[PDB]
């Protein structure tokens, strides 16, 4: 029940992070080679290409209310560029180890970064990028951080320690810790966006995707079928589907009501690493990225 069309594919070096601009028809990509790119996926014309560092850049988001992109790299630094002027406007060492994930608060001037240093950190760009809090307690690399879109005073961290921790700004330890049973770790965590379900979702190298009710703390469903590490899984914001991507080279679209697979796509770009949703979706791979239209 889903007409998947190809919008824009671009060959490049390995794409580790990806994000959609909320009002311009752009995607940001952050590459293994240290370059970051902004592309207009409608005109298929590059808007910016910047060599940021010599190391991988794994995390990248738009902060469109400031005309920014924010990126985090394996050289331990967070950098911000104004995409209208092209200029770097902030640059600081954020962690003493790799940055895996950056999340931006939807209404407040807060950024979270998750790191191989076992922490999440909260930065305030209206307080000279002050470190406002460090969230400690995970036992392995923090792979993914996400605000709860229904209450962004809380957020989740997914970690190779096999847990998700849900935290509140200004509170010392987690609201709660979810033990996932994904014994090879958690690579990704995402929240269901709409009010009807208090659900979250996790992806693992153990080849499973798990859906969680964060109120009951129970596992609602397990989605299996990928044949290698599952890099991500997310709920689509407007369609009743889940989209996952794997080192098996496939994207899978799952029915979010039935928890069964609907489509498996091999877009021919080798391993999948990252995802964004705008009914556009975009994913980064070993050999470039693709933007797809669903409806």
């Amino acid at each position: 029940k889903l007409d998947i069309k190809k919008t824009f594919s671009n060959r490049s070096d390995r794409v580790k992070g990806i994000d959609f601009h909320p009002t311009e028809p752009w995607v940001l990509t952050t590459l293994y080679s240290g370059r970051v790119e902004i592309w207009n996926y409608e005109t298929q014309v590059e808007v910016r290409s910047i060599q940021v560092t010599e190391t991988p850049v794994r995390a990248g988001k738009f902060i469109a209310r400031k005309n920014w992109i924010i990126v985090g790299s394996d050289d331990f630094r967070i950098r911000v560029f104004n995409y209208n002027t092209g200029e770097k406007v902030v640059d600081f060492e954020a962690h003493p180890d790799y940055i895996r994930s950056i999340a931006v608060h939807p209404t407040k001037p807060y950024v979270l970064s998750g790191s191989d240093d076992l922490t999440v950190k909260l930065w305030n760009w209206e307080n000279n990028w002050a470190l406002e809090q460090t969230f400690e307690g995970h036992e392995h690399f923090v792979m993914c951080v996400a605000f709860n879109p229904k209450d962004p005073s809380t957020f989740a961290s997914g970690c190779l320690d096999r847990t998700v921790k849900v935290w509140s700004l200004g509170q010392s330890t987690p609201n709660f810790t979810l033990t996932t049973g994904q014994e090879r770790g958690v690579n990704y965590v995402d929240y269901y966006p709409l009010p009807d379900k208090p659900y979250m979702i996790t992806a693992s190298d153990d080849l499973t995707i798990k859906i969680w009710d964060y109120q009951t703390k129970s596992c609602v469903a397990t989605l299996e079928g990928h044949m290698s590490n599952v890099s991500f899984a997310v709920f689509h914001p407007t369609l009743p589907i889940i989209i996952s991507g794997s080192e098996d080279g496939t994207l899978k679209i799952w029915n979010s009501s039935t928890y069964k697979v609907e489509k498996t796509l091999n877009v021919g770009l080798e391993r999948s690493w990252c995802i964004a949703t705008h009914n556009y979706i975009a994913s980064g791979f070993d050999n470039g990225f693709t933007v797809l239209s669903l409806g």
Binding site: D116, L160, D205
Partner: peptide
């Protein structure tokens, strides 16, 4: 080490 780097 591959998990950290890839």
């Amino acid at each position: 080490e591959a998990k950290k780097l890839v």
